[PDB]
Nucleic acid binder design. Structure first.
Ligand SMILES: [Mg+2]
Ligand SMILES: [Zn+2]
Ligand SMILES: [Zn+2]
Ligand SMILES: [Zn+2]
Lengths: 52, 51, 67, 82, 49, 263, 378, 46, 115, 404, 98
RNA sequence: UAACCGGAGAGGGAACCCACU
């Protein structure tokens, strides 16, 4: 998939501003590893924004 | 006589007075890994479908 | 390593006090005079300076990775 | 043995009470017909406990005596402890 | 030539013998490190008495 | 069945702290004001750190941790900002955040102390607490650098309150006291002579504690609120009262919606 | 801080603490062990009270706001070595494995590697991520790439490349992961009074003095009277005296120039109760506690036994080779052992079908065909 | 593609090609450290 | 990694309600109020304000679990009177208390500054 | 799930549990269930097995679920009791001078699950409404339960004399028609002994009700202990200095009585006990003086303590510690023993090089006349280390025999 | 290679008698805390076999005054067998009797 | 009177030492 392996930024919600990397992706949601903390989260694609 | 098993976890115990003697606290990471197999029936087919 | 910014218990800032504290110790001042010279009344703040060991100075004795 | 010669207990043991419920709720999970007008519950084990209190489980139990013989007890025929 | 003998740190034939703390920091060594051990395939070994 | 009327008098006012007395209220209201003093006063601290270079001996998250604990003077800007989780903007706008920058390189043979003075703000009003100390005192150390070491970073400051993280805690010490002479005997001294008297006690040296009264309730709450330096201590209190009142108003709105949607 | 040059020292399983402190109460023999130059612990403020019940059986309650300010925050360095070489043509080599060229490749992202086959420092990694891309040629190619250990989830600290004594290329990669104290982390004292964290409350929920002093740590009083560690109590008293005086306390054992009455008479001068007790108020209701609480500075330690290095589960993971039972180990994704005493307990319950579910279906269900005349398998 | 490394001893940045023996052109030192990456690091201050 | 994020103590998830009302069947004129993402800060002052009303027979609160973020308030009032109107009268009195306190505080602050 | 701690010795080491999901990364279990599992929360680990078939799920639910495992067939007692904080605060809660205001009563009633929503008439109605801790514990106790127990400090003569059914010390717990009339509740009422109140609850009422009876006690007592509070401190271990002089006189008189026995032994004035040699009867007499000294100092210490003490608050409740620990913290550690005898002559006819040869005295052979509060002399410190080493060995040695 | 093998593995002897030679000599130095390093560098070992029920060598003997720490020992199956070294205690190095 | 994409359970063992309940 295109989104997998891309550094992304959460741009909506409580997680707004957290930089992460996409591990897995679907059309509804995606899995992002947070750079700041040791936790992987599931976020909707509407909140994501590709950076770099 | 004794052997390794699937569907088991192990971690550190810690007190919690605020739940009954028949309850036990588990982390979400353990619970998101160990699975239970339910058989579908027309009762639970919608819940299992969403699941 | 280095002096903490805030006291763990209180939350009062202690991070600016350390060099002033070492200055006051290079005088006739004792510790019990230097701490309330800096205005540390609660013992939670006094243990932050009094029990600190400054290892950043020992770390700077090594050559860096770059130049 | 004959119905005249039932020398075992008229009480259902804890082991029978466990295994009858397990093997009934497994059947209910495999779309067997319930013997009780249920009240909207969907957990088959609660349905099996309801049928056990209702004394309507269609199972009988073969108790092997140590000589080799056995007795066939209906679940309706013996006393539920709880 | 007979061989090579593994040799104890901070000993009388180690290269760290009698050096000052500044020179130990120049060699990326710790002046508080007591020595008394061998380095063998890059792993510290200590003879228990 | 109605509200009580409390009164206030201040016994001390300083840039560092406020000391005051509240009369004619309940223990729960007094504790909740003491508690909103700690948890739920909005303040500005930095929460987004991007490091472009770090040749020092403290690693990156150690530095970002020490940067988050540096307080920032937000007396009136914090009232007009928005939470970044609530603002319509993408990544950061000046209506939701404040930008800081730090580009320090050590070149001389003397150890370079990176301080909070070396942070350059985007807004002149939102700055650390090197603002005014005239009528010599140092500034907050971040890292010490050797010759050849440097660091460069860019940071952003959000609005938050201390229920998230202790970097958004506007206060240092909130001394709280009711009934200094043990008149209600909510505590019980086994040897009351051994206990030192409080600061607010009214007793002679002969008497060790007040005589018990069954009818009494807790009143006369004595507060001392010490600031960290970001907010003025007088405007921690007003913002805490406004925050608690706003919370109660929102709860009443939600309950009103539930009731009129239930009938 | 276990050694001063810890950043040059490429070493597996390193733990260093953010802010170590020398103890407020020390013996005169710590000067010669150099303990006040490399200390292991923080002078906490303990309160010995039964606050909510999360500290009861040897556990301990912690201040969440202090942990947010950096209290016992540490960092864990793990390093990985790898060495390319071994056959006549079977050359190991560091490179990026390509899915068209290389045969066996995990689902993991390989884009984090540089084209040397390594990651640069400063890159976030996680479980099932490559760190060292290494391939051997296939007589197209098959990888021998090393993965980050599952559930480790850190950030790369440094990468060194060099030559071994065999003239082959050799790489060692060290990875940071900071460790914030959470519940379940094992703490201790200097008196054999160990304990795991049981809950963390914020500064608002924590009880407090007449001032705003809240304890960083709350321990149970029921760990004292059977253990009989009275040196813990005297340490907690001497620490309050020493933090008010400006002195470092002297706790050399057989001193005889110090006892509890002298320490009490010193503490009575600074405006406290002479036995260390203070009046704490409830953090929830604000009502002062009927008992008076024993509180003061005590030097606690942080042990290496976290919970995140011990938690593991399993649901039909990998399988052993010879007998088709699950593996062993947290790292190999192994299974727990339902040993000879546990089958015995399940016999004593009289649960034979759970016993069969453990020892047959959950470990190795299997079928064979056997001749009906002679019992040898067909 | 150049893959600049840093000498452990003389702190000299030097470009070494792939499949080359590790060596610094000055002082002949045989330990290289790589360099800090270019992609973004963003941290909470928590 | 099982750490819950810090915002979860005070932020409503999507589909959650701030407040929920359930009638108590055991006794008449009693009701249970469940509040999401609140703590002792709100429940204690609500309880203490409810206890000034003589028409309130019972009032109390609890947190079911500290790791959870919920609070339950049980109110029982005399017949002719509702626990719901008791609750909203307690809120609208407690807001009046805080507003009066804020006014008197800022007046005393101004009077401390050279007066 | 089924759930065990690994040295499984009896069938209450593997008990079923219901899963509740919680944020952080540890297993959490209720504090009474610590007692069968022998858990300690000091870094313990416990492993959890999930039953996969629905039939074995039902089997664990009906056979090995934990409230069904309350009373053991090993020793026909319950296994689980109130422990470690809820027990101490129960004893402090159900005392006669415990009174609760109306807000505190409603806060405590908020934590009962088995509560009808009905507030009981207070024990005092005027001047002001006051409930009693017994009056709330009567709401905790389920059904209509009847039992009679005795408190730990119940004097022996009291049943013989008057005031038998009206106790001055508030001992002799009596529960009648499901309601606590009188008595203070300790280990001997809510613990794991036979005929304790929990055991009567398990026998008269079902296991499901006894489950809620555990949880209700734990919740309401742990929420009263936020008001009462409970500590231990350095003030709890200190004494009067009238007591100190009495202890020193007891030690001095016993230590002189050792020396006069030694003088009778050296001058051949000691006749051997029949069935004993001269050495063993000398040893018997010396240990008799030293044990009587330790007991008399211990009793003097126990008489010295106040009502407000926190060592006494635990020992009377039976939660933690014993009556010898208080004496061993306050008064006298005692004699250190190795294999039942005194400290042996490890050197040539002496113990340490600080002692004269052939010194059979108390200080030369292991007796510690100092307390834990007063610190130890270095000779006594080394002897106490030698004493503790023996039990520390026996712990490690015992396991590989008992498991086999 | 003999010196390097015997120090690298701990089998104290020839590589052929790997099962015969005593092990546990030349452990990997514990580098967790500076106190752990010092205590691992000052450590004795009793080469009587473990898991034996004989308590007498495991006991604290009277000749340990001032030469071996009475407190410090591992709590496991090696109580009293592994024993660390007191502060001012010094071990002789040998000289000629001539 | 039109329009291009596609492959997936890996992975070993013995010995010794340290540590946890
Ligand atoms: Mg334990
Ligand atoms: Zn402080
Ligand atoms: Zn914005
Ligand atoms: Zn070079």
């Amino acid at each position: 998939n295109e989104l997998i392996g891309q550094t992304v930024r959460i741009s909506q919600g409580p997680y707004k501003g957290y930089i992460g990397v996409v591990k897995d992706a679907t059309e509804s949601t995606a899995r992002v590893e947070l750079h700041s903390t040791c936790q992987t989260i599931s976020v909707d694609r509407q909140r994501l924004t590709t950076v770099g | 006589m004794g052997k390794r098993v699937d569907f088991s976890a192990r971690t550190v115990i810690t007190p919690d007075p605020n739940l009954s003697i028949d309850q036990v606290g588990v982390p979400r990471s353990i619970a998101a890994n160990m699975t239970f197999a339910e058989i579908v029936t027309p009762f639970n087919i919608d819940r299992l479908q969403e699941l | 390593m280095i002096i903490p910014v805030r006291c763990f218990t209180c939350g009062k800032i202690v991070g600016n006090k350390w060099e002033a504290y070492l200055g006051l110790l290079q005088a006739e001042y004792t510790e019990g005079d230097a701490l309330d010279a800096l205005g540390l009344k609660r013992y939670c703040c006094r243990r932050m300076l009094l029990a600190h060991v400054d290892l950043i100075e020992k770390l700077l004795n090594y050559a860096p990775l770059e130049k | 043995q004959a119905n005249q010669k039932r020398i075992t207990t008229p009480y259902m043991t804890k082991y029978e009470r466990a295994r009858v419920l397990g093997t009934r709720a497994l059947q209910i999970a495999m779309c067997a017909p319930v013997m009780v007008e249920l009240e909207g519950e969907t957990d088959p084990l609660l349905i099996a406990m309801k049928e056990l209190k209702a004394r309507k489980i269609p199972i009988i139990i073969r108790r092997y005596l140590p000589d080799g013989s056995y007795e066939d007890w209906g679940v309706d025929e013996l006393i539920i402890s709880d | 030539f007979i061989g090579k003998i593994p040799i104890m740190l901070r000993s009388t034939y180690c290269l760290l013998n009698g050096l000052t703390d500044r020179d130990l920091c120049e060699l990326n060594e710790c002046p508080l490190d007591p020595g008394g051990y061998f380095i063998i395939n890059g792993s510290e070994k200590v003879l228990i008495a | 069945p109605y509200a009580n009327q409390p009164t206030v008098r201040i016994t001390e006012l300083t840039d560092e702290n406020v000391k005051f007395i509240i009369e004619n209220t309940d223990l729960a209201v007094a504790n909740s004001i003491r508690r909103v003093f700690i948890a739920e006063v909005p303040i500005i601290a930095i929460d987004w750190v991007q490091i472009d270079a770090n040749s020092s001996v403290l690693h990156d998250e150690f530095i970002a941790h020490r940067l988050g604990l540096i307080p920032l003077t937000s007396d009136d800007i914090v009232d007009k900002l928005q939470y970044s989780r609530d603002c319509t903007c993408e990544e950061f706008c000046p209506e939701c955040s404040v930008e800081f920058t730090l580009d320090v390189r050590c070149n001389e043979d003397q150890t370079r102390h990176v301080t909070s003075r070396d942070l350059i703000s985007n807004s002149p009003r939102v700055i650390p607490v090197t603002s005014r100390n005239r009528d010599e005192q140092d500034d907050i150390l971040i890292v010490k650098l050797r010759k050849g070491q440097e660091l460069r970073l860019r940071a952003y400051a959000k609005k938050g309150f201390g229920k998230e993280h202790a970097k958004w805690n506007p206060t240092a010490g909130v001394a709280f006291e009711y009934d200094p002479d043990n008149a209600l005997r909510h505590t019980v001294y086994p040897k009351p002579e051994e206990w030192p008297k409080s600061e607010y006690s009214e007793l002679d040296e002969d008497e060790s504690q007040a005589p018990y009264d069954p009818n009494g309730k807790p009143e006369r709450f004595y507060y001392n609120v010490e600031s960290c330096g970001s907010l003025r201590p007088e405007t921690i209190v007003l913002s805490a009262l406004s925050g608690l009142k706003k919370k109660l108003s929102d709860l009443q709105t939600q309950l009103s919606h539930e009731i009129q949607s239930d009938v | 801080v276990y050694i001063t040059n810890f950043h040059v020292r490429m070493d597996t399983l390193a733990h260093v603490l953010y802010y170590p402190q020398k103890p407020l109460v020390t013996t005169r023999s710590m000067e010669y062990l150099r303990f006040r130059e490399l200390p292991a612990g923080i002078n906490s403020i303990v309160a010995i009270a039964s606050y909510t019940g999360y500290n009861q059986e040897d556990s301990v309650i912690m201040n969440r706001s202090a942990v947010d300010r950096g209290f016992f925050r540490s960092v864990f360095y793990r390093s990985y070595k790898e060495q390319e070489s071994k056959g006549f043509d079977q050359e190991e080599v560091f490179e990026k494995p390509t899915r068209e060229t290389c045969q066996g490749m995990r689902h993991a992202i390989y884009d984090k590697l540089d084209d040397d086959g390594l990651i640069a420092p400063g890159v976030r990694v996680s479980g099932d991520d490559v760190i060292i891309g290494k391939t051997v040629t296939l007589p197209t190619k098959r990888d021998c790439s090393t993965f980050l250990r599952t559930s480790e989830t850190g950030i790369v600290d440094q990468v060194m490349v060099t030559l071994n004594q065999e003239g082959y290329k050799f790489c060692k990669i060290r990875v940071r992961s900071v460790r914030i104290p959470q519940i379940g982390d094992k703490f201790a004292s200097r008196h054999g009074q160990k304990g795991t964290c049981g809950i963390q409350y914020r500064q608002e929920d924590m009880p407090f003095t007449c001032e705003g002093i809240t304890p960083d740590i709350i321990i149970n009083p029921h760990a004292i009277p059977s253990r009989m560690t009275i040196g813990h109590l005297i340490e907690c008293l001497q620490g309050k005296v020493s933090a008010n005086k400006g002195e470092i306390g002297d706790a050399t054992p057989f001193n005889d120039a110090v006892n509890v009455q002298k320490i009490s008479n010193l503490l009575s001068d600074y405006g406290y109760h002479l036995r260390g007790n203070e009046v704490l108020y409830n953090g929830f209701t604000g009502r002062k506690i009927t008992s008076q609480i024993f509180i003061g500075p005590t030097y606690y330690q942080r042990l290496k036994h976290m919970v995140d290095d011990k938690i593991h589960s399993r649901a039909r993971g990998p399988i052993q080779i010879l007998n088709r039972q699950p593996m062993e180990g947290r790292s190999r994704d192994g299974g727990l052992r339902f040993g000879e005493m546990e089958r015995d307990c399940q016999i004593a319950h009289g649960a034979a079908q759970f016993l069969r579910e453990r020892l047959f279906e959950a470990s190795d269900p299997y079928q064979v065909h056997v001749c009906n005349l002679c019992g040898i398998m067909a | 593609q150049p893959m600049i490394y840093i000498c452990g001893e003389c702190h000299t940045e030097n470009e070494i090609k792939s499949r080359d023996p590790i060596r610094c052109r000055e002082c002949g030192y045989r330990i290289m450290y790589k360099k800090r990456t270019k992609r973004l690091v963003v941290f909470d201050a928590r | 990694m099982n750490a819950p994020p810090a915002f979860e103590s005070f932020l409503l998830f999507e589909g959650e309600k701030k407040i929920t009302i359930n009638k108590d069947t055991k006794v008449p004129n009693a009701c249970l109020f469940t509040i999401n993402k609140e703590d002792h800060t709100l429940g204690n002052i609500i309880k203490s304000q409810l206890l000034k009303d003589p028409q309130v027979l019972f009032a109390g609160y609890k947190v079911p679990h500290p790791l959870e973020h919920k609070i339950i308030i049980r109110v029982q009032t005399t017949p002719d009177y509702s626990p719901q109107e008791a609750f909203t009268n307690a809120i609208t009195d407690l807001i009046s208390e805080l507003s009066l306190l804020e006014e008197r505080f800022r007046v005393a602050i101004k009077d401390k500054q050279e007066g | 799930v089924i759930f065990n701690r690994q040295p499984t010795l009896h069938k209450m080491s593997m008990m079923g549990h219901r899963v509740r999901i919680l944020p952080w990364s540890t297993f959490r279990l209720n504090l009474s269930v610590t007692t069968p599992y022998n858990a300690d929360f000091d870094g313990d680990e416990m492993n959890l097995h999930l039953p996969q078939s629905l039939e074995t799920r039902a089997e664990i639910q009906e056979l090995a679920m934990v409230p069904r495992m309350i009373v053991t067939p090993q020793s026909n007692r319950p296994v689980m009791g109130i422990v470690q904080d809820t027990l101490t605060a129960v004893r402090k809660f159900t005392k006669r001078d415990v009174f609760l205001e109306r807000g505190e009563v409603m806060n405590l009633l908020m934590f009962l699950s088995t509560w009808d929503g009905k507030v009981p008439q207070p024990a005092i109605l005027k001047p002001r409404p006051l409930w009693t801790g017994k009056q709330i514990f009567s709401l905790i106790i389920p059904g209509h339960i009847n039992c009679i127990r005795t408190h730990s400090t119940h004097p022996d003569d009291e049943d013989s004399g008057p005031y038998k059914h009206i106790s001055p010390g508030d001992t002799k717990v009596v529960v009648e028609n499901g309601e606590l009339i009188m008595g203070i509740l300790c280990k001997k009422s809510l613990g794991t002994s036979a005929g304790s109140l929990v055991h009567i609850s398990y026998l008269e009422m079902g296991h499901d009700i006894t489950r809620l009876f555990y949880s209700n006690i734990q919740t309401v007592i742990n929420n009263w202990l936020l008001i009462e509070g409970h500590t231990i401190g350095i003030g709890d271990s200190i004494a009067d200095s009238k007591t100190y002089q009495d202890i020193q006189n007891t030690i001095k008189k016993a230590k002189q009585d050792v020396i006069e026995v030694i003088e009778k032994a050296h001058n051949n004035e000691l006749e051997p006990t029949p069935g004993n040699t001269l050495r063993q009867t000398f040893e018997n007499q010396v240990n008799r003086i030293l044990n009587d000294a330790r007991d008399k100092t211990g009793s003097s210490a126990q008489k010295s303590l106040s009502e407000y003490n926190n060592f006494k608050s635990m020992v009377v409740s039976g939660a933690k510690g014993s009556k010898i620990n208080i004496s061993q913290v306050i008064a006298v550690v005692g004699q250190q023993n190795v294999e039942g005898k005194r400290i042996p002559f490890g050197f040539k006819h002496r113990t340490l090089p600080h002692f004269i040869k052939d010194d059979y005295g108390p200080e030369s052979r292991g007796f510690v006349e100092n307390s834990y509060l007063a610190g130890l002399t270095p000779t006594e410190f080394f002897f106490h280390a030698m004493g503790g080493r023996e039990g520390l060995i026996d712990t490690a040695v015992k396991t590989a025999e008992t498991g086999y | 290679d003999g010196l390097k093998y015997s120090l690298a593995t701990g089998n104290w002897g020839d590589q052929k008698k790997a099962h015969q030679a005593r092990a546990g000599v030349s452990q990997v130095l514990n580098r967790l805390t500076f106190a752990s390093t010092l205590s691992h560098l000052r450590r004795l070992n009793s080469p009587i076999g473990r898991d034996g029920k004989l308590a007498k060598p495991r006991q604290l003997h009277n000749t340990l005054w001032g030469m071996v720490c009475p407190a410090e020992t591992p709590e496991g199956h090696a109580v009293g067998l592994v024993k660390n070294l007191a502060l001012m205690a010094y071990i002789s190095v040998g000289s000629q009797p001539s």
